[PDB]
Design an enzyme around this catalytic site. Structure first.
Site, PDB file in Angstrom:
ATOM      1  N   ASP A 107       0.703  -1.118  -0.094  1.00 59.21           N
ATOM      2  CA  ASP A 107      -0.093   0.076  -0.064  1.00 59.21           C
ATOM      3  C   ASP A 107       0.702   1.452  -0.030  1.00 59.21           C
ATOM      4  O   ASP A 107       0.432   2.140  -0.599  1.00 59.21           O
ATOM      5  CB  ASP A 107      -1.070  -0.104   1.209  1.00 59.21           C
ATOM      6  CG  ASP A 107      -1.957  -0.998   0.998  1.00 59.21           C
ATOM      7  OD1 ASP A 107      -2.174  -1.854   0.105  1.00 59.21           O
ATOM      8  OD2 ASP A 107      -2.747  -1.136   2.318  1.00 59.21           O
ATOM      9  N   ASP A 191      -2.175   5.594  -3.121  1.00 56.80           N
ATOM     10  CA  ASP A 191      -1.828   4.110  -2.670  1.00 56.80           C
ATOM     11  C   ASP A 191      -0.956   3.562  -3.779  1.00 56.80           C
ATOM     12  O   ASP A 191      -1.394   3.646  -4.801  1.00 56.80           O
ATOM     13  CB  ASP A 191      -2.989   3.307  -2.123  1.00 56.80           C
ATOM     14  CG  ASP A 191      -3.247   3.587  -0.728  1.00 56.80           C
ATOM     15  OD1 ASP A 191      -3.353   5.139  -0.140  1.00 56.80           O
ATOM     16  OD2 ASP A 191      -4.239   2.949   0.113  1.00 56.80           O
ATOM     17  N   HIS A 240      -7.052  -0.110  -4.419  1.00 57.13           N
ATOM     18  CA  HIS A 240      -5.986  -1.153  -5.044  1.00 57.13           C
ATOM     19  C   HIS A 240      -6.536  -1.874  -6.133  1.00 57.13           C
ATOM     20  O   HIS A 240      -7.766  -2.215  -6.066  1.00 57.13           O
ATOM     21  CB  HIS A 240      -5.859  -2.004  -3.512  1.00 57.13           C
ATOM     22  CG  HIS A 240      -5.298  -1.139  -2.495  1.00 57.13           C
ATOM     23  ND1 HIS A 240      -5.517  -1.659  -1.288  1.00 57.13           N
ATOM     24  CD2 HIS A 240      -4.701  -0.110  -2.012  1.00 57.13           C
ATOM     25  CE1 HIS A 240      -4.804  -0.805  -0.181  1.00 57.13           C
ATOM     26  NE2 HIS A 240      -4.532   0.186  -0.967  1.00 57.13           N
ATOM     27  N   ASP A 242      -4.623  -4.773  -7.255  1.00 58.56           N
ATOM     28  CA  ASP A 242      -4.035  -6.147  -7.331  1.00 58.56           C
ATOM     29  C   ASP A 242      -4.862  -7.095  -6.945  1.00 58.56           C
ATOM     30  O   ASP A 242      -4.560  -8.248  -7.057  1.00 58.56           O
ATOM     31  CB  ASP A 242      -2.798  -6.240  -6.383  1.00 58.56           C
ATOM     32  CG  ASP A 242      -2.653  -5.667  -5.056  1.00 58.56           C
ATOM     33  OD1 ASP A 242      -3.721  -5.175  -4.536  1.00 58.56           O
ATOM     34  OD2 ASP A 242      -1.889  -6.025  -4.161  1.00 58.56           O
ATOM     35  N   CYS A 344      -0.341  -8.132  -1.266  1.00 57.98           N
ATOM     36  CA  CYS A 344      -0.462  -6.841  -0.492  1.00 57.98           C
ATOM     37  C   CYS A 344       0.350  -7.027   0.733  1.00 57.98           C
ATOM     38  O   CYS A 344       0.892  -6.066   1.252  1.00 57.98           O
ATOM     39  CB  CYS A 344      -1.848  -6.784   0.182  1.00 57.98           C
ATOM     40  SG  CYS A 344      -3.115  -6.077  -1.102  1.00 57.98           S
TER      41      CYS A 344
END
EC number: 2.1.4.1
Lengths: 360, 360
Positions: A107, A191, A240, A242, A344
């Site tokens: 992050d 982020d 995010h 991912d 993450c």
């Protein structure tokens, strides 16, 4: 130089793995509300400022320690952030808040080449998150790595739309479609996890925590060597990329079936193999304070043919196996509650490889 | 029932399109040698077991994705086989081998009426090829379709003439004329592409991979409703009939000028229009690891007046146009290298129409 990573798949040699210790429930402010499922809003409203359930954190610590053991077994050097009490209330001239955690290195840190970049963040409770990683970074710096910190935002009220009309995740999806997010374009914010690497091309999505000014900063900072592209999806994750578009190899990507990419044809034209993973099997009663059930596809590649995948998610395991990719199964069911999976919970610092283009 | 196709031209509604992903160069064994041009023998000798050139595969993926886009545009439902790593070495009690690919659905699946048939195959490297199509087939089965698997051969040494005296394509043509092929009559074996459908009459050719026992099995299995006829040609293709005698409509067929049919008069007597296409224009330097330059006539009919033809082959395009057949041009020049054109890269699952006789 110990730092060197151009993508998400080259042979992994060094990684930083997060910590679950002393994690704190962030106060329930607008940007937290816009990045979580309604199911948990009252949890944040009540628990805000206190630690996440300690019995739960204890199981997560254990799961992550085992993961680190396996990484060492797989020949990867593991670094961990410093232990910090995240409950300390700090106060800048713009706001006051308590911290979150240093569970997700992805992050906040992104490695492009020999350069380690500290993202600015967009949550008031993550303002001083970089403090846990400074010892590691200073070491890489002494050893020759380039070190960059994107402009830390003031996070003044002007950065947030205090009246963001969200009452359900369904509303947010609609707003997201209209180009309306809880974060304005008052100043750069982002982020690092909203960015995914593929050599000379990096992909980003404007999300609830990453604005266009933030993406433009990255774009301007990395040009001309790297090209930062903005992509979008249907019913995107509030933050995010991912577990929506995980690039697992040269020209191979995992595309979340629930969040189709608007620019998918750019990739089909490039000759990229788009794989859609099977659905997660995680129980609906299991708490996921942040993130969605799709953490199953938040895999981390040790190399092109070796993937660290959740031990419980048999269906996505089988997929990788029929593809000839060896599965290293690890269970992090309790760590998942904190908001992340393998990708993450880590930040690949060094992968053996060179800078290439895969979009041709 | 989603499965229903009696011929090659009725209005197309559903089709399965192959995959180029993870294709592997088959090991250079006798049956591979007898089905390829000498020009490439050393390629197989060296590359056998490794993947086909990946930069090349990448261009093919892109070409096939576009083709699928166009099919959807033309109102056709498209299904694709599962992604599989074909490099896995398997071992039956009779032999050991690595796989090939699932690029050509026409080589392994043939639809006769509401029945989907899995051909046995004749190459050791194509033994477990059916695995990529099982998900699609089980779905059609659940939905009411008949499902058949012709007897899978043992592919023991006895099926092949290990000493097949072939040193050039010229030799093979001579042997083929003497009734000598690399495959014996030890057990049934065949590729579905050696069969071409015209309602109640199906045409087959004994080739390097389809023996008389294989044709007799089909004949016996489909009687009395269908009649399987054996036809032959001069200087025939080592495998597959669809770029030699492509039936494009009720009583209309494309007859490759270089491979005249010995039984052509049976068709002239039936009042069939035999069209001989103009020569291909594909560059001699372009690699065609399998197949010949005649892929130009390996067209797929969306209906009687709509044909999907290669964008580069202008001369055969003009032919169809003067015939009043609308040309849907698509470029698959790189996909061609794998061994097929539009007809090979697909398997028509459902065409709107009824069972008829066209030979009267």
């Amino acid at each position: 130089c110990p730092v060197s990573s151009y993508n998400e798949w080259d042979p992994l040699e060094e990684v930083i793995v997060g910590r679950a210790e002393n994690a704190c429930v962030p106060p329930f402010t607008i940007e937290v509300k816009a990045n979580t499922y309604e199911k948990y809003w009252p949890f944040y409203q009540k628990q805000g400022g206190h630690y996440f359930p300690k019995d739960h954190l204890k199981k997560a610590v254990a799961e992550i320690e085992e993961m680190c053991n396996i990484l060492k077994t797989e020949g990867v050097t593991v670094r961990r952030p410093d232990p910090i009490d995240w409950s300390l209330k700090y106060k800048t001239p713009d706001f006051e808040s308590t911290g979150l955690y240093s569970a997700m290195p992805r992050d906040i840190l992104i490695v492009v080449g020999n350069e380690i970049i500290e993202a600015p963040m967009a949550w008031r409770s993550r303002f001083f998150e970089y403090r846990a990683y400074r010892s590691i970074i200073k070491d890489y710096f002494h050893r020759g790595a380039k070190w960059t910190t994107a402009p830390k935002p003031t996070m003044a009220d002007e950065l947030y739309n205090q009246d963001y009309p969200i009452h359900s995740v369904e509303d947010r999806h609609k707003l997201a479609a209209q180009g309306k997010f809880v974060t304005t374009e008052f100043e750069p914010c982002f982020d690092a996890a909203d960015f995914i690497r593929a050599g000379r091309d990096i992909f980003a999505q404007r999300s609830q925590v990453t604005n266009y000014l933030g993406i433009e900063w990255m774009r301007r900072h990395l040009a001309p060597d790297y090209r930062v592209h903005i992509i979008s999806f249907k019913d995107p994750n509030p933050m995010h990329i991912d577990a929506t578009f995980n690039i697992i190899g040269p020209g191979i990507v995992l595309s979340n079936p629930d969040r189709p990419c608007h620019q998918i044809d750019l990739f089909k034209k490039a000759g990229w193999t788009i794989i859609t993973p099977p659905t997660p099997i995680i129980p609906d009663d299991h708490p996921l304070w942040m993130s969605s059930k799709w953490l199953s596809m938040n895999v981390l590649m040790l190399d092109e043919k070796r993937v660290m995948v959740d031990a419980n998610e048999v269906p996505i395991q089988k997929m990788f196996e029929k593809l000839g990719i060896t599965t290293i199964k690890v269970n992090i069911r309790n760590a998942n509650s904190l908001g992340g999976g393998f990708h993450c919970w880590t930040c690949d610092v060094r992968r053996r490889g060179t800078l290439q283009s895969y979009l041709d």
